[PDB]
Amino acid sequence: HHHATNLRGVMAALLTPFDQQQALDKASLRRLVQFNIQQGIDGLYVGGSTGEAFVQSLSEREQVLEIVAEEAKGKIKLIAHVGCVSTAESQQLAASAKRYGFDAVSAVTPFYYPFSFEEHCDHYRAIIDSADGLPMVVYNIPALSGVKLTLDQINTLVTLPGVGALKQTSGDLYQMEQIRREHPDLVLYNGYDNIFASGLLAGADGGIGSTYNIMGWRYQGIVKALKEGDIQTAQKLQTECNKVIDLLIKTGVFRGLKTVLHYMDVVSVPLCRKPFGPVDEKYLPELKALAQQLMQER
Amino acid sequence: HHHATNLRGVMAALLTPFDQQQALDKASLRRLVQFNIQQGIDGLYVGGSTGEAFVQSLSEREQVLEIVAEEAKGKIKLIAHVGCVSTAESQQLAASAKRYGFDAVSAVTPFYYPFSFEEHCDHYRAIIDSADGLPMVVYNIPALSGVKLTLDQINTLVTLPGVGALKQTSGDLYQMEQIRREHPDLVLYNGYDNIFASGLLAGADGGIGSTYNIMGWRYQGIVKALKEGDIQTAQKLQTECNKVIDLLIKTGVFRGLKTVLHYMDVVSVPLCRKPFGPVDEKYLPELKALAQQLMQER
Amino acid sequence: HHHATNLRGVMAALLTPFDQQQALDKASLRRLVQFNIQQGIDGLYVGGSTGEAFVQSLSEREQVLEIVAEEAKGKIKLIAHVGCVSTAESQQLAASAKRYGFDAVSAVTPFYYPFSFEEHCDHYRAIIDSADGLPMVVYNIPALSGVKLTLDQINTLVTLPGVGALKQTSGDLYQMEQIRREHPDLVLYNGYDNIFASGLLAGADGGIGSTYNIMGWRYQGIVKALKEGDIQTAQKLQTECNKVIDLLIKTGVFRGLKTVLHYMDVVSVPLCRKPFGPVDEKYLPELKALAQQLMQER
Amino acid sequence: HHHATNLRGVMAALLTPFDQQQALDKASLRRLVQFNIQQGIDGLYVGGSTGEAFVQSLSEREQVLEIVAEEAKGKIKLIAHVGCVSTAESQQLAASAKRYGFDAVSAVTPFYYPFSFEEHCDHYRAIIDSADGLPMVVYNIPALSGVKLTLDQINTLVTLPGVGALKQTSGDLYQMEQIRREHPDLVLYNGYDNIFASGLLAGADGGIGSTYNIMGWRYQGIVKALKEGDIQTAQKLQTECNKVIDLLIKTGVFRGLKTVLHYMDVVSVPLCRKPFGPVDEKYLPELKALAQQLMQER
């Protein structure tokens, strides 16, 4: 864990922009990468849940990884989410992430079909082998994956050879503290943006999140406030983030984010892929206003 | 609903055989189709959960659909499970099922990402359009999909134009009865093999199931016995099925079934795809005995 | 299990009548006991969930047990639901049930606080001791109790010395069959009325239910139809029961039942205890019509 | 909400001491009240979940409330948990709490039977009426109660006339922040001890907890640390609390706490009421050493 500390920080879970025909919008992808760099984000987590990975083909996910590395390699940290249900498919993506010069790979616990804990562990070992030296970020999201690991199971996973971090998308901040207590050196990313400040206090040392695409500097600000013992600033920031997240939960999170980015002149066409539908047009004034505010604040 | 009556019956959820390198085992696939036909199954449900769809590429799923239709078209009913999380991917598979001459398509409620009910409805409508005349079998499996439709939502879904059946993989037999009561003419497939007789009594008029690959005629026997008022025979058959299902749940159902079929000289290599592991060797004596019994019964 | 054979059958879960001051209405209690006897019910299950046990004192529950025994002892079977969260309170009620001459006691798995399996076993042992020879009906209702016993645990529970039956208020009809298979002689009551026919087919050999108070003869009719191989009659009866159950779920089940009984001239005041509220006025016409229908049927 | 400000703080959820005969141990109750006062606790929450409310009679609960008021009225704040499933029973306890001179009443959302939101509201209204001027602390504990109120429902409940606070025993710290945001003046108690620091950071302004009986000074330490901007001390204190809570979860929390208090010479007999069993003998050395360490610490 210690030798992977350079993975610590605040990393945006990158969205994947699509054009009007629902194909990859490469110009908006590049813009979004540059926008994140200019914001001072520590890194990008590519092809995750937020990137709409599970409605893309392997080739499409590869195309995104390739373009992001072209734009960002060596400028900020890059973590390739390569996870699929299939081990072999995940391995293909891990090999591609290596080819493109990513700093790390990551995989969601494979979902849909129930797998035993040992099966989960072998899946990660295989993907780690294919990544040929890139550290692995285990990605735990029980709300969506349906996988219910015990703490002892988590401890085993995060100590497999080659694992350098955990992306913990869980609101159980008792478990967050227990993981920190067991693994003093582990890179531990808070996954739910709406509890970020409280997650850091429990023991997370950074985060990966969808809303960082539009306001990542706020999360950076929370890290700084807490380190400096400025609790009022940390709380006020989290409150502002949560006002934004309330709205995005109403609009739909990925599409609301894309829409804000549209009004920030990053994303040409703010659609998610079917079966996601469009943002209700009623929200456009508020989302326009939020883009405007964030641009003035930034 | 009345127009798709001929979809009524007992349809095996076809397994997809793999070779030692985890590629499609085409020879075992063809043998398995012929074996199902020879034992009198009413039809095949291809590329479903049991078929390991969600650890196959679109191309791989199409290759399986194409080969099954070559072997079986016009001899038994053929239902293509075309469902993916992506609507567009599902549409590609529906078009392919039409080109290969399937009798119907089916799609699991798309999973992982939460979608609204309207989004679910638009997903089915798009797939129905791409199926170009093949009726749609809505596939509900809340335990794995994470989708929690209300009864009123199910009623709306199953009355969309082009829907001719529901595959109901749910153990809620109150809801089974309520669905039958609302839709007297709907083809209603019981999805949990271990409650088949009870599902029929509640209102299902057939089933789709994984264990039918090895003992489908027992389920047909249950249909006949209930039709004839022979409750004892139906219960006896259901008891024998459930003894087998207890074992398959211990072994892992798909790989257990593949292993029985291996000992029946149908499937050359009884592996599932990673991250599924192999069957524990401690279960082989029972799986071997079951194969021996079923060969002497059929 | 063989020793308790005479507990098999169809037993109404008796409602506890109250008046407008929320006091026990003993005259309506007696009337309801006689109304049930005349339906040809096999027995009564007194002071259960349906009997509003958990909003009564021990004294009130005892007063009700004593009166039911006066009215019905020797005429029909009598099961006293003595269960409380507290073991000692449950024991007091069990001792009282013995004094009043009940045929059996019953206890819900104690709820609210999580208890270990050993703790549940000791609770049943302690109540069985106080029951002083009355067999015990274990009462499993996971939806309300929060208790999630495994099948192995259920098996150990139902084979404790002194246990003569299981009241299984669960819709898992695989488990219903598995229980019957492990325990061929066990009295096994179906607890969800809206799956009664399917529950019998799975292996239940009777039932205990709230709706039996107003139409218990229908459930006896389903038992008889299944035995005689008249599957369509069993189905049609279950369908009629479920039409009624749809309405009672809309109105609130216990209070809807009490309201029907009120319109049948059995129950003076159709109230449940606070925090149950009254029936919505808009449903009274349907409840009155249902009472009239059921009175005509009988 | 502004008029209940004086209820803000760190209140121990008082344990109810029993003897080997499972009778109330009134001498140990007084000792435990005085011990808590000496720790500098802001107040006591009496006859709650931790107080084993739901395995006591009303008379027993009243006897405890009366003794605690004798020991502590005017010295620390006193909140009577009067909640039962029954509204009338809860009202009796509320009237008694008023007679005894408590500062506030509180009631768990009534459990076991599902009630409508309107029913929950009316339950709280009726208890408030019987509390005759004493403010109400709404008590939300979804894990045990089975009640799943929406945020809008919680907002309505905590703004009923007479409600002065919310005891929020939930680990959802997004919702904790949402509640603070909507109700800037509301007294908001964090209910899960093992996330106390993070709960305060999200917007709780105090807490009610079981483990405060043995180390309440630690929780007061966390409040002070956060107030000063001393994040390190707050984290270190929470970590120490969690080391203890890990052990208590292993041993069983209430009985583990009583056992520590026994080794501190406070509680004569460290038993909970049946169906709670005793502490496993294997854990006694750890609990004694813990008591010794806390005695040395304070």
Side-chain angles (χ1 to χ4, degrees), chain A residues 1 4-297, chain B residues 1 4-297, chain C residues 1 4-297, chain D residues 1 4-297:
Chain A
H1 294 160
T5 74
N6 66 16
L7 290 176
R8 188 181 297 156
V10 171
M11 319 296 193
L14 190 66
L15 297 144
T16 302
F18 301 115
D19 67 18
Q20 253 295 130
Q21 290 68 64
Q22 312 229 334
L24 176 64
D25 176 350
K26 298 173 193 166
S28 295
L29 177 61
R30 300 180 138 108
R31 274 189 295 259
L32 179 61
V33 173
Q34 293 306 325
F35 186 79
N36 271 285
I37 292 165
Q38 298 164 352
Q39 269 188 267
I41 207 73
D42 293 325
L44 296 170
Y45 186 85
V46 187
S49 299
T50 301
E52 283 176 80
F54 311 117
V55 295
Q56 289 173 87
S57 67
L58 303 184
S59 172
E60 283 172 334
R61 287 172 71 173
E62 288 171 342
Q63 180 174 221
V64 169
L65 296 174
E66 183 168 22
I67 288 166
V68 174
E70 280 190 51
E71 293 291 318
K73 180 179 172 52
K75 296 166 179 172
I76 56 168
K77 297 295 181 309
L78 295 176
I79 305 166
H81 172 76
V82 299
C84 303
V85 183
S86 167
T87 308
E89 291 184 351
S90 302
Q91 288 178 295
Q92 179 184 135
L93 292 183
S96 294
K98 174 66 178 215
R99 289 203 312 282
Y100 308 146
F102 275 71
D103 300 294
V105 296
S106 186
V108 67
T109 53
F111 53 87
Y112 194 83
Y113 299 116
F115 299 113
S116 70
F117 182 58
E118 184 74 267
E119 290 168 342
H120 278 110
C121 289
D122 279 344
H123 178 84
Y124 285 94
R125 292 174 178 115
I127 298 163
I128 285 162
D129 189 49
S130 289
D132 198 32
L134 283 51
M136 162 68 72
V137 182
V138 171
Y139 174 24
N140 181 218
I141 180 168
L144 303 191
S145 71
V147 179
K148 298 179 155 35
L149 303 174
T150 67
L151 176 65
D152 286 337
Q153 284 169 344
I154 292 178
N155 288 338
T156 293
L157 271 188
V158 303
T159 57
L160 293 171
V163 173
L166 175 66
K167 179 181 179 194
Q168 171 79 166
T169 301
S170 166
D172 178 352
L173 293 190
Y174 176 39
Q175 186 168 99
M176 190 75 79
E177 188 276 327
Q178 290 175 116
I179 293 167
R180 168 57 66 216
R181 175 143 44 90
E182 180 79 8
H183 309 103
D185 298 328
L186 177 72
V187 171
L188 180 56
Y189 301 110
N190 182 89
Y192 280 128
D193 300 6
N194 53 20
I195 65 175
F196 183 88
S198 287
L200 291 180
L201 185 62
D205 59 8
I208 293 170
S210 62
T211 67
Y212 305 2
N213 286 278
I214 62 165
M215 65 196 185
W217 66 87
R218 291 177 172 184
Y219 299 94
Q220 301 283 233
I222 289 168
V223 172
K224 178 180 175 303
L226 291 181
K227 278 184 190 156
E228 290 175 344
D230 183 4
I231 300 165
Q232 298 160 312
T233 298
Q235 286 181 311
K236 179 296 197 313
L237 288 165
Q238 186 70 57
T239 294
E240 292 308 301
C241 292
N242 285 191
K243 292 175 181 181
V244 169
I245 292 161
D246 287 359
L247 173 57
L248 296 169
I249 286 167
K250 289 188 280 184
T251 64
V253 171
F254 308 155
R255 64 191 172 211
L257 287 166
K258 286 180 174 186
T259 298
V260 176
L261 287 161
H262 174 252
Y263 293 115
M264 300 179 156
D265 301 309
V266 181
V267 166
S268 299
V269 185
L271 287 175
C272 290
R273 270 187 174 179
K274 294 290 195 186
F276 287 112
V279 171
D280 190 319
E281 291 184 307
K282 76 189 190 182
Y283 293 120
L284 295 186
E286 304 170 68
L287 288 170
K288 303 169 32 200
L290 174 58
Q292 292 173 0
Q293 175 202 16
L294 290 172
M295 289 192 283
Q296 179 91 351
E297 181 179 312
Chain B
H1 295 166
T5 299
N6 58 15
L7 291 178
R8 182 173 311 114
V10 172
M11 318 301 192
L14 186 73
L15 295 148
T16 300
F18 303 116
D19 69 19
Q20 254 300 134
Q21 291 69 60
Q22 311 233 334
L24 296 172
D25 178 353
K26 295 178 271 213
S28 290
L29 174 62
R30 292 180 183 275
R31 189 66 233 138
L32 174 60
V33 175
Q34 286 310 329
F35 182 78
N36 268 279
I37 291 168
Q38 291 161 0
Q39 54 195 204
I41 206 59
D42 296 323
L44 293 176
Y45 185 86
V46 185
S49 297
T50 302
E52 285 176 79
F54 311 116
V55 291
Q56 288 168 71
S57 69
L58 302 186
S59 175
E60 283 169 335
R61 290 172 67 173
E62 287 171 337
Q63 290 166 51
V64 168
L65 294 173
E66 184 177 32
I67 289 166
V68 176
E70 286 187 35
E71 291 289 333
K73 182 183 172 288
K75 298 174 182 156
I76 55 174
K77 299 304 186 166
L78 294 177
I79 303 165
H81 172 74
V82 302
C84 305
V85 181
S86 162
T87 309
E89 292 184 354
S90 303
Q91 288 177 296
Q92 176 186 139
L93 292 182
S96 295
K98 171 75 170 187
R99 294 200 309 284
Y100 306 146
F102 276 70
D103 298 299
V105 297
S106 187
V108 67
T109 56
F111 53 87
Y112 195 83
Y113 297 120
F115 301 113
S116 67
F117 182 59
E118 184 185 330
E119 283 165 352
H120 281 111
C121 290
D122 277 345
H123 179 85
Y124 285 94
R125 292 181 182 110
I127 299 165
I128 285 161
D129 185 80
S130 295
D132 196 23
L134 298 195
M136 162 69 71
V137 181
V138 171
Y139 174 23
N140 179 219
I141 180 168
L144 304 189
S145 72
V147 175
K148 296 185 163 33
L149 297 180
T150 67
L151 175 62
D152 291 334
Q153 283 169 347
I154 289 175
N155 291 338
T156 292
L157 270 191
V158 303
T159 50
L160 291 170
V163 174
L166 177 63
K167 179 180 173 192
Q168 173 78 165
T169 305
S170 165
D172 182 350
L173 294 188
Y174 174 39
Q175 185 169 97
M176 191 73 82
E177 184 283 323
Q178 291 176 119
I179 292 163
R180 171 55 69 210
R181 176 141 44 93
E182 182 76 14
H183 315 279
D185 297 321
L186 178 74
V187 175
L188 180 56
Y189 300 112
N190 183 88
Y192 283 126
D193 298 9
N194 53 23
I195 63 177
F196 186 88
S198 288
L200 291 180
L201 187 69
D205 61 7
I208 294 168
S210 65
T211 70
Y212 303 7
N213 283 278
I214 66 169
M215 64 198 185
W217 65 85
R218 293 182 170 174
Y219 299 95
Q220 288 169 147
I222 294 167
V223 173
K224 177 174 187 283
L226 294 174
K227 201 167 301 175
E228 284 166 351
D230 184 354
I231 299 195
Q232 230 70 166
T233 295
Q235 290 188 309
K236 183 300 182 322
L237 283 170
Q238 189 73 54
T239 295
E240 293 305 306
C241 289
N242 288 192
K243 295 170 169 173
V244 166
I245 295 164
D246 288 358
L247 171 61
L248 292 174
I249 288 169
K250 288 179 154 176
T251 67
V253 174
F254 309 157
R255 59 186 173 218
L257 288 162
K258 283 175 170 185
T259 301
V260 173
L261 289 157
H262 177 244
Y263 291 127
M264 296 178 170
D265 207 28
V266 177
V267 166
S268 295
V269 182
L271 291 175
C272 291
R273 265 185 176 180
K274 292 291 189 196
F276 289 110
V279 173
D280 191 315
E281 280 174 15
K282 72 188 177 173
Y283 295 121
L284 300 178
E286 286 163 288
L287 293 165
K288 284 170 63 180
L290 181 53
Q292 299 171 326
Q293 180 200 351
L294 292 172
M295 298 173 348
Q296 293 169 317
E297 181 180 319
Chain C
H1 294 172
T5 203
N6 58 5
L7 298 171
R8 182 186 307 144
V10 174
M11 321 297 185
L14 189 67
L15 293 149
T16 303
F18 306 111
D19 69 21
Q20 198 66 47
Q21 282 78 46
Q22 308 247 306
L24 293 173
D25 173 354
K26 290 174 178 179
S28 290
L29 178 62
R30 288 185 203 271
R31 213 171 291 110
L32 180 56
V33 170
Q34 297 303 327
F35 187 72
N36 272 284
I37 287 174
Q38 293 161 1
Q39 301 193 219
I41 213 62
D42 296 321
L44 293 174
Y45 187 89
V46 186
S49 300
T50 302
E52 286 174 79
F54 314 114
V55 293
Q56 284 169 72
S57 64
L58 301 190
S59 171
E60 286 170 338
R61 292 177 63 179
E62 287 175 341
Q63 285 171 63
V64 172
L65 293 172
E66 180 177 41
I67 287 159
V68 177
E70 287 175 351
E71 291 295 316
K73 183 187 174 278
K75 300 168 185 169
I76 54 167
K77 293 298 171 330
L78 293 183
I79 305 168
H81 173 74
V82 302
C84 303
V85 181
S86 163
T87 309
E89 292 183 352
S90 306
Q91 286 174 298
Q92 183 186 130
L93 294 182
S96 295
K98 168 77 176 181
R99 285 202 311 281
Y100 306 149
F102 276 73
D103 299 293
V105 298
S106 186
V108 66
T109 58
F111 53 86
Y112 194 86
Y113 300 117
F115 301 114
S116 71
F117 180 64
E118 184 49 39
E119 286 170 343
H120 278 109
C121 291
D122 281 346
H123 177 85
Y124 286 99
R125 296 180 171 112
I127 299 163
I128 286 163
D129 188 49
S130 291
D132 194 22
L134 278 58
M136 165 67 72
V137 183
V138 172
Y139 173 26
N140 181 218
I141 179 169
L144 306 187
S145 72
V147 180
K148 307 181 179 66
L149 300 175
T150 64
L151 175 63
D152 285 330
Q153 286 171 340
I154 288 165
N155 289 339
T156 300
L157 264 194
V158 305
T159 54
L160 291 173
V163 174
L166 176 64
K167 182 181 172 193
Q168 174 81 165
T169 305
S170 166
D172 182 348
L173 293 194
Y174 176 35
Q175 184 166 101
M176 191 73 78
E177 186 277 327
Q178 289 175 119
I179 291 164
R180 166 57 65 214
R181 181 145 40 90
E182 178 73 15
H183 307 103
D185 295 325
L186 178 65
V187 174
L188 182 56
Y189 304 107
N190 184 90
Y192 282 129
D193 294 7
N194 54 18
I195 64 179
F196 182 85
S198 288
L200 292 183
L201 185 57
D205 62 6
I208 293 167
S210 62
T211 68
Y212 303 6
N213 285 276
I214 65 170
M215 67 197 181
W217 65 87
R218 296 183 168 175
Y219 297 97
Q220 297 281 225
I222 291 167
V223 169
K224 184 166 173 304
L226 287 184
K227 187 147 321 168
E228 289 170 359
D230 187 358
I231 296 193
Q232 302 212 320
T233 297
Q235 291 183 301
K236 303 335 139 183
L237 285 166
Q238 188 66 59
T239 292
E240 288 310 305
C241 289
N242 285 188
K243 286 175 183 181
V244 169
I245 292 164
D246 287 359
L247 171 63
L248 298 169
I249 290 168
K250 188 166 77 181
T251 64
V253 173
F254 305 156
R255 63 181 174 220
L257 290 164
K258 289 177 162 183
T259 300
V260 169
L261 292 160
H262 179 247
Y263 290 134
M264 294 174 162
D265 291 330
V266 178
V267 163
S268 297
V269 178
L271 288 176
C272 291
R273 268 180 177 180
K274 297 293 197 191
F276 288 114
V279 172
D280 192 313
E281 288 240 56
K282 77 193 180 185
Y283 295 134
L284 297 180
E286 285 164 278
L287 294 164
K288 183 167 189 167
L290 172 57
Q292 296 169 334
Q293 182 202 349
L294 291 173
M295 284 189 282
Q296 178 59 206
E297 178 169 318
Chain D
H1 294 165
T5 306
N6 69 348
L7 296 175
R8 176 181 313 121
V10 174
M11 318 301 194
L14 190 68
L15 294 147
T16 304
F18 300 113
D19 67 25
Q20 290 277 165
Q21 326 309 147
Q22 315 248 319
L24 293 171
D25 175 351
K26 293 176 177 178
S28 292
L29 176 64
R30 294 188 200 265
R31 241 181 264 111
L32 182 57
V33 174
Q34 296 306 331
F35 185 71
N36 267 288
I37 290 169
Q38 297 156 8
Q39 289 179 234
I41 208 73
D42 293 328
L44 293 173
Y45 187 88
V46 183
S49 297
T50 303
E52 285 177 80
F54 311 115
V55 291
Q56 286 169 74
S57 68
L58 307 190
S59 163
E60 295 167 333
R61 291 173 66 175
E62 288 171 339
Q63 289 173 61
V64 171
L65 292 175
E66 180 176 46
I67 289 163
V68 176
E70 282 169 359
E71 292 297 310
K73 174 174 179 294
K75 292 156 178 169
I76 54 166
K77 299 291 178 168
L78 289 181
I79 305 171
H81 170 74
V82 303
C84 304
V85 181
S86 158
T87 310
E89 292 181 355
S90 305
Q91 284 177 299
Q92 179 187 135
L93 292 182
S96 297
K98 171 75 180 182
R99 285 198 315 280
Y100 304 151
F102 273 72
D103 300 292
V105 297
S106 180
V108 68
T109 56
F111 53 91
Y112 195 85
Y113 299 114
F115 303 110
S116 73
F117 181 57
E118 178 177 14
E119 289 170 342
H120 279 109
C121 288
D122 288 349
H123 179 85
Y124 282 99
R125 280 173 191 120
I127 299 164
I128 288 158
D129 187 56
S130 291
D132 193 28
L134 273 56
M136 166 69 74
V137 185
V138 173
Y139 174 26
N140 182 219
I141 182 171
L144 299 193
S145 75
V147 181
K148 303 196 164 46
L149 295 191
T150 64
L151 176 64
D152 185 61
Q153 282 167 344
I154 291 169
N155 287 338
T156 294
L157 257 198
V158 301
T159 57
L160 293 177
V163 176
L166 174 65
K167 185 184 169 187
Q168 175 77 165
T169 303
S170 166
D172 181 348
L173 297 191
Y174 174 39
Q175 183 169 99
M176 187 80 72
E177 190 276 328
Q178 291 174 116
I179 292 167
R180 174 53 68 213
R181 178 137 49 86
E182 178 70 18
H183 307 105
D185 293 331
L186 174 69
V187 173
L188 182 58
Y189 305 107
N190 176 90
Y192 280 125
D193 296 8
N194 54 18
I195 64 177
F196 185 83
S198 288
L200 290 179
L201 188 60
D205 59 6
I208 296 168
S210 62
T211 68
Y212 302 8
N213 287 277
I214 66 168
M215 65 201 183
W217 63 89
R218 289 190 173 170
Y219 297 97
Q220 301 283 228
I222 290 166
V223 168
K224 177 148 172 288
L226 294 178
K227 194 143 313 199
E228 287 167 3
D230 186 357
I231 182 176
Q232 312 268 28
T233 295
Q235 291 183 294
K236 278 158 168 42
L237 287 170
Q238 185 71 55
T239 290
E240 291 307 304
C241 289
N242 283 192
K243 290 177 175 172
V244 168
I245 292 162
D246 289 0
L247 171 59
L248 296 171
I249 290 173
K250 188 164 73 182
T251 65
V253 174
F254 306 157
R255 59 186 177 215
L257 285 166
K258 290 178 158 183
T259 297
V260 170
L261 287 160
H262 177 247
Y263 290 129
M264 295 175 161
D265 258 51
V266 178
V267 167
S268 296
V269 181
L271 289 172
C272 291
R273 266 184 174 179
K274 297 292 196 181
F276 293 108
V279 173
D280 189 312
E281 287 290 308
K282 78 189 172 182
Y283 296 134
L284 297 182
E286 284 162 279
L287 291 166
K288 186 169 179 174
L290 174 54
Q292 292 169 335
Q293 186 269 314
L294 295 169
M295 295 188 275
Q296 174 65 205
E297 176 171 319

